[PDB]
RNA sequence: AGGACCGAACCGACUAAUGUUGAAAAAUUAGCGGAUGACUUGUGGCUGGGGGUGAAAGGCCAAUCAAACCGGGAGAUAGCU
RNA sequence: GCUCGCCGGAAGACCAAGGGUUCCUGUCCAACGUUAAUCGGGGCAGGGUGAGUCGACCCCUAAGGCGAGGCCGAAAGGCGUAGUCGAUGGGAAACAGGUUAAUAUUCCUGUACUUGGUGUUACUGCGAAGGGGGGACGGAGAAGGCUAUGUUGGCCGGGCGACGGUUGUCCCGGUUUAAGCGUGUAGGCUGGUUUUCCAGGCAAAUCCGGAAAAUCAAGGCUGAGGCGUGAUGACGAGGCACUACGGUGCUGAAGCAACAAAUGCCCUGCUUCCAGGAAAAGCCUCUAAGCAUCAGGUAACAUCAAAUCGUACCCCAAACCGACACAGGUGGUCAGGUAGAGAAUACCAAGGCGCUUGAGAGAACUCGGGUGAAGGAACUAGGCAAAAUGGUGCCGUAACUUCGGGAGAAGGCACGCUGAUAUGUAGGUGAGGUCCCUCGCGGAUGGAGCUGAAAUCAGUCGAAGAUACCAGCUGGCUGCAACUGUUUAUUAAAAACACAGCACUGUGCAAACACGAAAGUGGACGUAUACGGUGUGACGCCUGCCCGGUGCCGGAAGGUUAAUU
RNA sequence: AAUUCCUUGUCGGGUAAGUUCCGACCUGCACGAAUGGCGUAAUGAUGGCCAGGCUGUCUCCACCCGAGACUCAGUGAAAUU
C-alpha cells in the first residue's frame, strides 16, 4: 500500500526550506515564532 | 473529399474523414514555427477559467500573415499545408524577392497560382485589397476590423463576408453569422472564400477523437449535487427549474451583449 | 487500419474463502477485467478551505471532508448529563 | 564439510530515489533479535569511500518560479517587461586486465582520448548582445543487413569408470581478448560545379533565400557490422617448488569453424497515417560598428592545466515508505539451458536461499487440499462454491445483422514413438573452384559443409500420445445501456457518469464567459464550418396538442414610480 | 412494464407441480414522445429465466494428505474486572 509520505529532499527543501520561508513575510513570521520558542532546528534545512 | 470509414469495429462505424491529397505530406516551413504550450484552460492564477479544455496532441504554431501588407510584390503558392491550430488550411507562398509566408488558403487556390496585394492588384481570389477598391457585392474573407491590424473576420474553414454597400468612408458587411456590420472603407480584405468547406462534414465518430482535439468531457449539471450546480440533484431526474449557467444566468434566450461602446457599426444583429 | 481480438509484464478490483485483539488501520489465496490506448509510469511544476479539483460519488484535497489541518478569539454557550 | 529442498523475467546481478556507516576486521552477549546464541543490520574499538574521461558542479533552456523599472492595489500585496533562476531534456573526452579483509572505468600495468592556457614557426581578414544553417524531435507498420548470445563440430587437456557394458559415433572442462586507430561495406539522403543579377533575412553580408545562363554526369553527406591493428601482450583449463593447508611466484596447451539468432544496432532510417508531433546553447557560417607593417584567425610542434563535491553499504528490501527484523508499496538496467508462439509455464545454469521458536502426539473442531459407491441441483434467495471445458491442423457452422459481424457459433476427425519415402526431403545458409572486373568488404557461376520443417505410407507400446504444468463450459428467451471507457481510496462498478451524434441558446472580437477590489490572465496567438452554456445521448422510424401560469425575447399609447428640483 | 395498488390480473407456453420467466389481452391505481417515444446487430466481471454437460451443492456423509488445535521446553499478550 502506497502511504502518504514519499520522501524527496529536493521537494522538501523547496517546500519548507529556509530560503522558501524567507521568500514571503508569512514564512518569515514562522521563523520568528520558532526563534522565540527557542527551537533548536528552525527548518528542515538538513 | 469525404470518405466514410468501414464498420470494422465500434468507434469506426460512424467515423467520417475529410482527406485532402493536395496537402503537403511533409514537415512545415521551420522558420515560420513557434512554440505553442497548452494551457489546460487555466489562467495566470492557476484556476480553470474555461472548462472542458485539456490534453490533446502536441501542436506547433504557424506564423500566418493576416496583414498581407507586402504590396506590389507578386507571390506564388508553393504548397498547401495542414494547420493544427485552425480548421482552415494554410498555403506557403514564395514572393519574387525570396521571402516566404503563410496565408489562409482560399476556395480554389492551388500550387503555382499567383497572388498579389495592394490597391493595384487584380480582383482574383487570394488577392488582398482595401474595401475601397473591392467592387460592391463581391465575396471576401480575412476581413480587417480596423485598418492595418490584421484580418479578424471570416477566417474559419468555409466562412466569408459579403459587401452589401459602401457609404463613403464606411462599407457595410454581411458577416456570415447575420450581422450587417459596417467597417471603415480602408481595411484590407482578401477575395474569395476560405476553402475547407468539407470540414463541417467531418464526423469524429468516437469519444477518443474529441480527446485528441483537447476537449475534456462535459458533465451536464442536472446529474450533479445542488452544492455544485444550480440544477442540482433530486431523487431521480427532477430538473424542476429554469435552465441556467453554473453561475446563475438563463442560457435560453437571455442576451448577454452589454458592450455599448460601439453601438454604431451594428446595422442589424442576426435572424 | 482498429478507444479491434486472445494473452504475460503493467494498471485495475467482479466473485468466493480466509483474516476481523489480522502478516496487513482493506491484505492474502484461487478465479476475474483492460492490456496501442479516453492507456500506463518516473521526475518537476501549478490550482488552497465556502476555496480547489471532480467522465459527478458529495468523490478527493497527507490513514481526517455536507466545508482540511494548526494556532488564536476561548475558560464560546450548554434551561442538559 | 557431505547430502536434501527452494528461487532462477528472481527469492540472481547493477543503479536512481531514499536512508546515512547499516560496509570490513577484532572484541563483547546485559538490553535489542518474538526461543537459545559462541551468532547479528546489537554494544565497544579500529579501518574503509583515491577520477581531466563516471555523476554533480558547470554551459543551455521547458513547464514554472522570482522579477530592476513599470502597471495595479486601504496596508500587506498582486501581475508582469528587461532579465535571472529552474531537468525530468541538449552540450568535450577511457578501455581491457590485475589488485584490497573492506574502494576502483577512481589505485596498478598496457594502450588511448577530450577541451583550454602559454610559447615557437609558417600562412593569413579578424571582429556580435546581430543574420542564416544546424541542433530539432509524433504514432503505427514493414522488412533487409548485423551484433549480443546460443548450439554443434573441430581443436587442446584430462578421464577409462563403486554394479552389466563403456579405446568409441564414448565422458568432463576449456576454446576468452576491449576502447582507440586504419579501412568506409549492407544500406539511407541529396543532381554537382562556375559566373551574373535581386523590393527578402530590422543595418550590412562572400552566408541564407530568390531569379537567369553555361558546363559535367559523378559529387558530397550519413552509416551498423565485418576485417586489420591494438595483441611476440593480456587472459587461459591444468601443472611445478614454496604451501601457517590461509595462499602466492614461475610455467601454462588449444584459443578455430559452421549454424541459429534478438524486444539490442544500422534506424533521429524507410513506408504509411492524422490527432500534424519542445525550447535554447555548444557547433558551422555571415558580415556590422571596429582593428590592420598590429590585434586576431588557421595549422604544426612544445609545454602547462583540467579545480571543487559525490564515490562505503542496502536499494522489490531486515538498511527506503508502512509505529515492528511487518505475507503490503517502490522507478530504471542486465535477460543462460531443455520444452514452448512467448519475458506464460515446468525443470535447471550462473548466483542466492530454506523465510530467528523447536520437539512429540496423530482426538473433536477449524483451515488449505486429494479421492468417492448409486443418484446428479433433489442444495440454495441464487448452480454460491466446486466440478467441468481448455492446444494445433482440417472439415463444418444457425437465427439475426448496421453486411463488419454473430463465429473459436454448435459439432466432428487426426495427434506418441520407430522406419521408409529422403543413409536429413522441401526450404534456409553457403565454402572451394571457375568466369568477369572501375583488381574491391566486388559481381556471376558453383555447389561442398552446416541447418532443417511438414506430409504420406508402414510398423509398434499403453487403459489413456494437445498424456505433466499450461490451457474457452456451451446453447435458447428477455429487461436496461449503443459500444471502448469513468465512478463512491476503505461494504454500492451499476440501469449511474462519459461518449460520438442531435437540438436550443449566447457570443462580431477589447467576443460571450470565467479567475481577479484592480492591473491583468484564460477563452485564443482562436474569429460564427469559431467559442461558451444547457438538455438529449450511436444508428433506424419519429418526436403530436397547449403560450393561461413562470421564465425568456420584442413593443409603444396609457397608468404607476426613485434620487433630484 | 425498472412504471399495475387491487394482483400470484386473465389465457397460452415451459414443469409431475412455475407468486419468477416468455408470448398475448388492455380494466394504463399512476406509459408517452429530446428531463425524448418505440425498435435495434454488436458489446457487458450488468438484471431475470430455461436447457445440455458437470459435479460432495445435496440425499448422506466416509476416508486420506498437510497447517493449527492437544502434550513437553523457551519466550510471553489482550479485551474485561
3-state secondary structure chain B: CEEECCCCCCCCCCCEEECCCCECCCCCCHHHEEECCCCCCECCCCCECCCCECCCCCCEEECECCCCCCCCCCEEEEEEECCCCCCCCEEEEEECCCCEEEEECECCCCCCCEECECCCCCCCCCCEEEHHHCCCCCEEECEECCCCCCEEECCCCCCCEEEEEEECCEEEEEECCCCCEEEECCCEEEECCECCHHHHHCECCCHHHHHHCCECCCCCCCCCCCCCCCCCCCCCCCCCCCCCCCCCCCCCCCCCCCCCCCCCCECCCCC
Residues of CATH 2.40.50.140 domain(s) within chain B? 1-113
Reference B210, options B92, B54, B86; nearest CA is: B54
Q: Nearest nucleotide, C1' to the C-alpha of B240? A: E35
Protein residue with the closest CA to the C1' atom of nucleotide E42: B10
Rounded CA separation B168/B259 (Å): 26
Reference B155, options B182, B188, B185, B184; nearest CA is: B188
Rounded CA separation B111/B39 (Å): 35
Rounded CA separation B82/B92 (Å): 11
CB B199 within 8 A of CB B157: yes
**Domain B195-271: top CATH class:** few secondary structures
- Domain with A40, as residue range(s), is 1-46
Interatomic distance B202 CA / E39 C1' (Å): 28
Complete edge-to-edge strand list for the sheet that includes strand B100-104: B100-104, B90-95, B75-81, B114-115
In the block, which residue shows the cell 503558392? B77
Here the CATH number for the domain that contains residue A18 is: 1.10.287.3980
Integer-rounded Cα Rg, in Å, for chain B is 22
Interatomic distance B207 CA / D286 C1' (Å): 52
Protein residue with the closest CA to the C1' atom of nucleotide C38: B208
Rounded CA separation B91/B102 (Å): 6
Q: Nearest nucleotide, C1' to the C-alpha of B154? A: D527
Q: Alpha carbon B94 to chain centroid distance?
A: 24
CB B145 within 8 A of CB B153: yes
Q: Which residues pair with B33 in a beta bridge?
A: B62
Interatomic distance A4 CA / C61 C1' (Å): 13
Give the resolution value in Å.
Answer: 2.5
B203 beta carbon to strand C: under 7 Å: no
- The SS3 assignment for A31 reads helix
User: Residue B208 is placed in which grid cell?
Assistant: 477518443
Q: Nearest nucleotide, C1' to the C-alpha of B237? A: E35
Interatomic distance B169 CA / D303 C1' (Å): 81
Residues of CATH 4.10.950.10 domain(s) within chain B? 195-271
Q: Alpha carbon B178 to chain centroid distance?
A: 16
Say if residue B180 is exposed, middle or buried (CB neighbours under 10 Å; 0-12, 13-18, 19+): middle
- The SS3 assignment for A41 reads coil
Q: Which CATH architecture has domain B1-113?
A: Beta Barrel (2.40)
Rounded CA separation B247/B244 (Å): 8
Q: Which residues pair with B61 in a beta bridge?
A: B34
Interatomic distance B237 CA / E7 C1' (Å): 29
**CB atoms closer than 10 angstroms to residue B148:** 10
Rounded CA separation B25/B30 (Å): 15
User: Residue B20 is placed in which grid cell?
Assistant: 485532402
Reference A21, options A36, A39, A33, A9; nearest CA is: A33
Task: Provide the domain count of chain A.
Answer: 1
> What DSSP element (H or E) covers A2?
none
Q: Which residues pair with B191 in a beta bridge?
A: B140
Q: Nearest nucleotide, C1' to the C-alpha of B205? A: D500
Interatomic distance B51 CA / D532 C1' (Å): 9
Q: Which residues pair with B17 in a beta bridge?
A: B3
Q: Which residues pair with B3 in a beta bridge?
A: B17
Q: Which residues pair with B153 in a beta bridge?
A: B143
Q: Nearest nucleotide, C1' to the C-alpha of B6? A: D404
Rounded CA separation B59/A33 (Å): 49
User: Residue B150 is placed in which grid cell?
Assistant: 490584421
Amino acid at each position: 500500500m502506497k502511504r502518504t509520505f514519499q520522501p524527496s529532499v529536493l521537494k522538501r527543501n523547496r517546500s519548507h526550506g529556509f530560503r522558501a520561508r524567507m521568500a514571503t513575510k508569512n514564512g518569515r513570521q514562522v521563523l520568528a515564532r520558532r526563534r522565540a520558542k527557542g527551537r533548536a532546528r528552525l527548518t528542515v534545512s538538513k | 473529399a469525404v470518405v466514410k470509414c468501414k464498420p470494422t469495429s465500434p468507434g469506426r462505424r460512424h467515423v467520417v474523414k475529410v482527406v485532402n491529397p493536395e496537402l503537403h505530406k511533409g514537415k512545415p516551413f521551420a522558420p515560420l514555427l513557434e512554440k505553442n504550450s497548452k494551457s489546460g484552460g487555466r489562467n495566470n492564477n492557476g484556476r480553470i477559467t474555461t472548462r472542458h479544455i485539456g490534453g490533446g496532441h502536441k501542436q506547433a504554431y504557424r506564423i500566418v500573415d493576416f496583414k498581407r501588407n507586402k504590396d506590389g510584390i507578386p507571390a506564388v503558392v508553393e504548397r498547401l499545408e495542414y494547420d493544427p491550430n485552425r480548421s482552415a488550411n494554410i498555403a506557403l507562398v514564395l514572393y519574387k524577392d525570396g521571402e516566404r509566408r503563410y496565408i489562409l488558403a482560399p476556395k480554389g487556390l492551388k500550387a503555382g497560382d499567383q497572388i498579389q496585394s495592394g490597391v493595384d492588384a487584380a480582383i482574383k481570389p487570394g488577392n488582398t485589397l482595401p474595401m475601397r477598391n473591392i467592387p460592391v457585392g463581391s465575396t471576401v474573407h480575412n476581413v480587417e476590423m480596423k485598418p492595418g491590424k490584421g484580418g479578424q473576420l471570416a477566417r474559419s474553414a468555409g466562412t466569408y463576408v459579403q459587401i452589401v454597400a459602401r457609404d463613403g468612408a464606411y462599407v457595410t458587411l454581411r458577416l456570415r453569422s447575420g450581422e450587417m456590420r459596417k467597417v471603415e472603407a480602408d481595411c484590407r480584405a482578401t477575395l474569395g472564400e476560405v476553402g475547407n468547406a468539407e470540414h463541417m462534414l467531418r464526423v469524429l465518430g468516437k469519444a477518443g477523437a474529441a480527446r485528441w482535439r483537447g476537449v475534456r468531457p462535459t458533465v451536464r449539471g442536472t446529474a450533479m449535487n445542488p452544492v455544485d450546480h444550480p440544477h442540482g440533484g433530486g431523487e431521480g431526474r427532477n430538473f424542476g427549474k429554469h435552465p441556467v449557467t453554473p453561475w446563475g444566468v438563463q442560457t435560453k434566450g437571455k442576451k448577454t451583449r452589454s458592450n455599448k461602446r460601439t453601438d454604431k457599426f451594428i446595422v442589424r444583429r442576426r435572424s
